[PDB]
Enzyme design. Structure first.
Site, PDB file in Angstrom:
ATOM      1  N   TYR A 264     -54.150   4.161 -23.872  1.00  0.00           N
ATOM      2  CA  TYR A 264     -53.635   2.745 -24.006  1.00  0.00           C
ATOM      3  C   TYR A 264     -54.164   2.021 -22.876  1.00  0.00           C
ATOM      4  CZ  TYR A 264     -50.653   4.656 -27.747  1.00  0.00           C
ATOM      5  OH  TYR A 264     -50.092   5.186 -28.922  1.00  0.00           O
ATOM      6  N   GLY A 265     -53.946   0.643 -23.026  1.00  0.00           N
ATOM      7  CA  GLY A 265     -54.152  -0.499 -21.918  1.00  0.00           C
ATOM      8  C   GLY A 265     -53.329   0.109 -20.646  1.00  0.00           C
ATOM      9  N   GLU A 268     -45.495   1.511 -19.154  1.00  0.00           N
ATOM     10  CA  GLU A 268     -44.635   0.546 -18.409  1.00  0.00           C
ATOM     11  C   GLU A 268     -43.485   1.755 -17.739  1.00  0.00           C
ATOM     12  OE1 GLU A 268     -44.975   0.329 -21.663  1.00  0.00           O
ATOM     13  OE2 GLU A 268     -43.043   0.106 -22.818  1.00  0.00           O
ATOM     14  N   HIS A 292     -48.023  -7.853 -18.086  1.00  0.00           N
ATOM     15  CA  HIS A 292     -47.435  -7.390 -19.144  1.00  0.00           C
ATOM     16  C   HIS A 292     -46.494  -5.988 -18.733  1.00  0.00           C
ATOM     17  CE1 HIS A 292     -46.871  -6.651 -23.518  1.00  0.00           C
ATOM     18  NE2 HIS A 292     -46.696  -5.440 -23.390  1.00  0.00           N
ATOM     19  N   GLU A 293     -47.205  -5.071 -18.223  1.00  0.00           N
ATOM     20  CA  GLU A 293     -46.496  -3.892 -17.627  1.00  0.00           C
ATOM     21  C   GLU A 293     -45.435  -4.332 -16.770  1.00  0.00           C
ATOM     22  OE1 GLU A 293     -47.055  -1.763 -19.799  1.00  0.00           O
ATOM     23  OE2 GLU A 293     -49.194  -2.321 -20.379  1.00  0.00           O
ATOM     24  N   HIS A 296     -42.270  -5.567 -18.638  1.00  0.00           N
ATOM     25  CA  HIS A 296     -41.505  -4.776 -19.318  1.00  0.00           C
ATOM     26  C   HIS A 296     -40.328  -4.150 -18.490  1.00  0.00           C
ATOM     27  CE1 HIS A 296     -42.825  -3.540 -23.166  1.00  0.00           C
ATOM     28  NE2 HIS A 296     -44.196  -3.303 -22.586  1.00  0.00           N
ATOM     29  N   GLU A 315     -41.780  -5.480 -27.336  1.00  0.00           N
ATOM     30  CA  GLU A 315     -42.855  -6.116 -27.336  1.00  0.00           C
ATOM     31  C   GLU A 315     -43.107  -7.545 -27.235  1.00  0.00           C
ATOM     32  OE1 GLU A 315     -44.977  -4.412 -25.496  1.00  0.00           O
ATOM     33  OE2 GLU A 315     -44.443  -2.522 -25.883  1.00  0.00           O
ATOM     34  N   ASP A 372     -47.063   6.504 -34.167  1.00  0.00           N
ATOM     35  CA  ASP A 372     -48.257   6.573 -33.685  1.00  0.00           C
ATOM     36  C   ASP A 372     -49.206   5.868 -34.896  1.00  0.00           C
ATOM     37  OD1 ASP A 372     -47.769   7.535 -31.268  1.00  0.00           O
ATOM     38  OD2 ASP A 372     -48.588   9.718 -31.721  1.00  0.00           O
ATOM     39  N   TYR A 380     -46.199  -7.088 -31.131  1.00  0.00           N
ATOM     40  CA  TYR A 380     -46.581  -7.689 -30.003  1.00  0.00           C
ATOM     41  C   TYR A 380     -46.533  -9.298 -30.492  1.00  0.00           C
ATOM     42  CZ  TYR A 380     -47.901  -3.331 -27.755  1.00  0.00           C
ATOM     43  OH  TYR A 380     -47.793  -2.064 -27.278  1.00  0.00           O
ATOM     44  N   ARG A 560     -59.696   4.539 -24.452  1.00  0.00           N
ATOM     45  CA  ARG A 560     -58.614   3.457 -24.795  1.00  0.00           C
ATOM     46  C   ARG A 560     -58.726   3.302 -26.340  1.00  0.00           C
ATOM     47  NH1 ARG A 560     -58.138  -2.426 -22.051  1.00  0.00           N
ATOM     48  NH2 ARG A 560     -56.072  -3.139 -23.290  1.00  0.00           N
ATOM     49  N   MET A 561     -57.472   3.715 -26.960  1.00  0.00           N
ATOM     50  CA  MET A 561     -57.619   3.307 -28.273  1.00  0.00           C
ATOM     51  C   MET A 561     -57.889   1.848 -29.069  1.00  0.00           C
ATOM     52  SD  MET A 561     -54.999   6.121 -30.133  1.00  0.00           S
ATOM     53  CE  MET A 561     -53.709   5.836 -29.193  1.00  0.00           C
ATOM     54  N   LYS A 562     -57.417   1.078 -28.415  1.00  0.00           N
ATOM     55  CA  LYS A 562     -57.893  -0.307 -28.881  1.00  0.00           C
ATOM     56  C   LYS A 562     -59.387  -0.586 -28.807  1.00  0.00           C
ATOM     57  CE  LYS A 562     -57.597  -5.120 -26.936  1.00  0.00           C
ATOM     58  NZ  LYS A 562     -56.956  -5.822 -25.784  1.00  0.00           N
TER      59      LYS A 562
HETATM   60  N1  LIG Z   1     -45.971   0.474 -24.042  1.00  0.00           N
HETATM   61  C1  LIG Z   1     -47.427   0.728 -23.719  1.00  0.00           C
HETATM   62  C2  LIG Z   1     -47.709  -0.592 -22.586  1.00  0.00           C
HETATM   63  C3  LIG Z   1     -47.667  -1.807 -23.285  1.00  0.00           C
HETATM   64  O1  LIG Z   1     -47.341  -1.769 -24.663  1.00  0.00           O
HETATM   65  O2  LIG Z   1     -48.275  -2.837 -22.679  1.00  0.00           O
HETATM   66  C4  LIG Z   1     -48.462   0.773 -24.864  1.00  0.00           C
HETATM   67  N2  LIG Z   1     -47.865   1.703 -25.723  1.00  0.00           N
HETATM   68  N3  LIG Z   1     -48.201   3.097 -25.458  1.00  0.00           N
HETATM   69  N4  LIG Z   1     -47.611   3.876 -26.475  1.00  0.00           N
HETATM   70  C5  LIG Z   1     -47.233   3.050 -27.224  1.00  0.00           C
HETATM   71  C6  LIG Z   1     -46.448   3.006 -28.589  1.00  0.00           C
HETATM   72  C7  LIG Z   1     -45.776   2.084 -29.110  1.00  0.00           C
HETATM   73  C8  LIG Z   1     -44.957   2.182 -30.505  1.00  0.00           C
HETATM   74  C9  LIG Z   1     -45.270   3.564 -30.915  1.00  0.00           C
HETATM   75  O3  LIG Z   1     -44.722   3.404 -32.358  1.00  0.00           O
HETATM   76  C10 LIG Z   1     -44.209   2.255 -32.952  1.00  0.00           C
HETATM   77  C11 LIG Z   1     -45.420   1.541 -33.599  1.00  0.00           C
HETATM   78  C12 LIG Z   1     -44.938   0.343 -34.327  1.00  0.00           C
HETATM   79  C13 LIG Z   1     -43.748  -0.203 -34.492  1.00  0.00           C
HETATM   80 CL1  LIG Z   1     -43.375  -1.322 -35.280  1.00  0.00          CL
HETATM   81  C14 LIG Z   1     -42.778   0.850 -34.008  1.00  0.00           C
HETATM   82  C15 LIG Z   1     -42.978   2.015 -33.263  1.00  0.00           C
HETATM   83  C16 LIG Z   1     -46.031   4.334 -30.685  1.00  0.00           C
HETATM   84  C17 LIG Z   1     -46.671   4.175 -29.606  1.00  0.00           C
HETATM   85  N5  LIG Z   1     -47.529   1.749 -26.681  1.00  0.00           N
HETATM   86 ZN   LIG Z   2     -45.752  -3.851 -23.994  1.00  0.00          ZN
END
Ligand SMILES: N[C@H](CC(=O)O)Cn1nnc(-c2ccc(Oc3ccc(Cl)cc3)cc2)n1
Ligand SMILES: [Zn+2]
Ligand SMILES: [Yb+3]
Ligand SMILES: [Yb+3]
Ligand SMILES: [Yb+3]
Length: 607
Positions: A264-265, A268, A292-293, A296, A315, A372, A380, A560-562
């Site tokens: 990920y980017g 937090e 952003h981090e 959080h 988010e 995931d 977001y 990075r998955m993005k």
């Molecule tokens: N928190 C990190 C920093 C940032 O976001 O800036 C980025 N990040 N890393 N891992 C994850 C992550 C978040 C949620 C997940 O499940 C979901 C997805 C969609 C929904 Cl609606 C609910 C639950 C799975 C993984 N997010």
């Molecule tokens: Zn976030």
């Protein structure tokens, strides 16, 4: 109800503390040790409890110095296996006991990535990092793997002496290991109650540099100097965030720049934010990820979503606070530019999923869904758009920032739902309930697609991006000679990125237009990961074969998955690169982050 967890819920028992004693074995790719959970019963006559586990080997369970009976249930796919523990004595309500579980992780733990020396910057030492969000903490240790439970933690981590361990906690010393002089024990303390997805561990050849009064930047020696410069605005951002959210309660705010496969980017992790090295643009242009981090530390880490269905709470508010930090540093016109860009990313996600897709809803239902797989920009950006709409409806940013600070104070150290948030919003804005009653709550919260109302956005900084994108889209062959490097002279890196995002929304463009864009703007030379990613997607979707080795190299040299997921999907959609994309994934799969390998596999339809 937390539908992603198989553990006893918070209404039955609650974990108050975790004391972790473990050893990182790089030869076996295992984390081995004991997880001592202080559990408080929430019920009368409690005789058993259930914990979440995933691919864990359990040696024994000790309570009151004696081994107890436990049983592992059948595996439930991505949820893992439930672990039922028989308590030696029935517990009364509020009674606390300590449960010590001896365990070992699988080398295939979905929470972890084990890196060989060749996958690191230094080439001499291996590296390990965790990523528990959302439900991977159960793949490290037995726990109530749900954000509805908050606990403090202590840890003692044994590692080869040449390496350094870091956690989402305050560093509490280091000593040689009394059992093995080739090892060191690093100690950690997390005094603030946190959800278990915030437990994090990194082990590697790490060095640090101070960049602020409460911030060290950590990375392998090769990245320290560049990271210190890239993240130099950190302290200024922490000061603005404290002004908006109230006291920073975590003590330290350190940054860790991970190897390129970090999925990920950022993450937090409390006291220690993790970041992708793809932020190392050389000019601080990708610093909104730091903002952003940092945000959080209030929204998400202090006020947490009770279940993953309410993730937008985490988010939406974080993006809202992030955009205010960047608006304080760079001006209100810049905040409107980033917000309008966010609406565009929301348009892209809605188009990709489909306008009736259940993951385009703000409040989701993750029953039988791998979190995931659900991950997208929707929580977001649809969450940010709701808050930005309410800000405009309720009297502006100054008034809405008052609500935000009161929301954090009200719910600090708690795990809440959309109804808790809505109830507090109505309570705080009691004098504006008539205005709040005009909101289509059912549509905003529960309906799929784009929101029912689009907010108002200042266009100042977006106009030049739109104008240039439109010149390119409407250009015919005889117009191509009019474009020149001078078209970009007054554009910031952010505007160049927006020009590419606007153009990519109308992709493909004719191949001759893309070739001319490279001839006049030389986008192939840009190392900024966001710009390079959109430019490579535009080339591939416009069927430029020369872009194939560039897109494959970007999709594989970082993880990075993005960036990796859309690059592989675009490469698989292009007939000329389809086979290469599949073969490249196949050869790299064993060496990829486990979550990234799984998702790229699903995207490519490669089992
Ligand atoms: N928190 C990190 C920093 C940032 O976001 O800036 C980025 N990040 N890393 N891992 C994850 C992550 C978040 C949620 C997940 O499940 C979901 C997805 C969609 C929904 Cl609606 C609910 C639950 C799975 C993984 N997010
Ligand atoms: Zn976030
Ligand atoms: Yb200490
Ligand atoms: Yb109410
Ligand atoms: Yb013409």
């Amino acid at each position: 109800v937390d539908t992603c967890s198989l553990a006893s819920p918070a209404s039955v028992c609650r974990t108050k503390h975790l004391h972790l004693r473990c050893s990182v074995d790089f030869t076996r790719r295992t984390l081995t040790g004991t997880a001592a959970l202080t559990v408080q019963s929430q019920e009368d006559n409690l005789r058993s409890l259930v914990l979440d586990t995933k691919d864990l080997t359990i040696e024994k369970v000790v309570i009151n110095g004696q081994e107890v009976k436990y049983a592992l249930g059948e595996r439930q796919s991505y949820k893992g296996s439930p672990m039922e523990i028989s308590l030696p004595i029935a517990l009364s309500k509020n009674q606390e006991i300590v449960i010590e579980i001896s365990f070992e992780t699988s080398p295939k733990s979905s929470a972890l990535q084990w890196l060989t020396p060749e996958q690191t910057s230094g080439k001499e030492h291996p590296y390990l990092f965790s990523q528990c969000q959302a439900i991977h903490c159960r793949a490290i240790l037995p726990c109530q793997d749900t954000p509805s439970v908050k606990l403090t933690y202590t840890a003692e981590v044994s590692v080869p002496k040449e390496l350094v361990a870091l956690m989402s906690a305050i560093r509490d010393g280091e000593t040689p290991d009394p059992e093995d002089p080739s090892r060191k024990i690093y100690k950690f303390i997390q005094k603030v109650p946190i959800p278990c997805y915030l437990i994090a561990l990194v082990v590697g050849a790490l060095e640090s540099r101070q960049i602020g009064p409460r911030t060290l930047v950590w990375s392998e020696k090769e990245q320290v100097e560049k990271s210190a410069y890239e993240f130099s605005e950190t302290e200024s951002m922490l000061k603005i965030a404290e002004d908006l959210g109230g006291p920073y309660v975590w003590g330290q705010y350190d940054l860790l720049v991970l190897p390129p496969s970090f999925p990920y980017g950022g993450m937090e992790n409390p006291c220690l934010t993790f970041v992708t090295p793809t932020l190392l643009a050389g000019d601080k242009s990708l610093s909104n990820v730091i903002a952003h981090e940092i945000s959080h530390s209030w929204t998400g880490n202090l006020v947490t979503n009770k279940t993953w269905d309410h993730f937008w709470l985490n988010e939406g508010h974080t993006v809202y606070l992030e955009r205010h930090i960047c608006g304080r540093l760079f001006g209100e016109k810049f905040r409107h530019f980033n917000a309008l860009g966010g609406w565009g990313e929301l348009q892209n996600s809605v188009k990709t999923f489909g306008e009736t897709h259940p993951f385009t809803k703000l409040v989701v239902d993750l029953t039988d869904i791998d979190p995931d797989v659900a991950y997208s920009s929707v929580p977001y950006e649809k969450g940010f758009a709701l808050l930005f709409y309410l800000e405009q409806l309720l009297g502006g940013p100054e008034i809405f920032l008052g609500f935000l600070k009161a929301y954090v104070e009200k719910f600090s150290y708690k795990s809440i739902t959309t109804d808790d948030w809505k109830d507090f919003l109505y309570s705080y804005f009691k004098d504006k309930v008539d205005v709040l009653n005009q909101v289509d709550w059912n549509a905003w919260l529960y309906s799929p697609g784009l929101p029912p109302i689009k907010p108002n956005y200042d266009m100042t900084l977006t106009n030049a991006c739109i104008a240039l994108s439109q010149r390119w889209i409407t250009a015919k062959e005889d117009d191509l000679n009019s474009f020149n490097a001078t078209d970009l002279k007054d554009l910031s890196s952010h505007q160049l990125n927006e020009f590419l995002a606007q153009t990519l929304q109308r992709a493909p463009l004719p191949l001759g237009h893309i070739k001319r864009m490279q001839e006049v703007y030389n986008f192939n030379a840009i190392n900024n990961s966001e710009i390079r990613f959109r430019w490579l997607r535009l080339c591939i979707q416009s069927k430029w074969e020369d872009a194939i080795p560039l897109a494959l190299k970007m999709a594989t040299e970082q993880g990075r998955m993005k960036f990796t997921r859309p690059l592989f999907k675009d490469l698989a959609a292009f007939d000329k690169s389809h086979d290469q994309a599949v073969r490249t994934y196949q050869e790299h799969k064993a060496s990829m982050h486990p979550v990234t390998a799984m998702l790229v596999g699903k995207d490519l339809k490669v089992d």
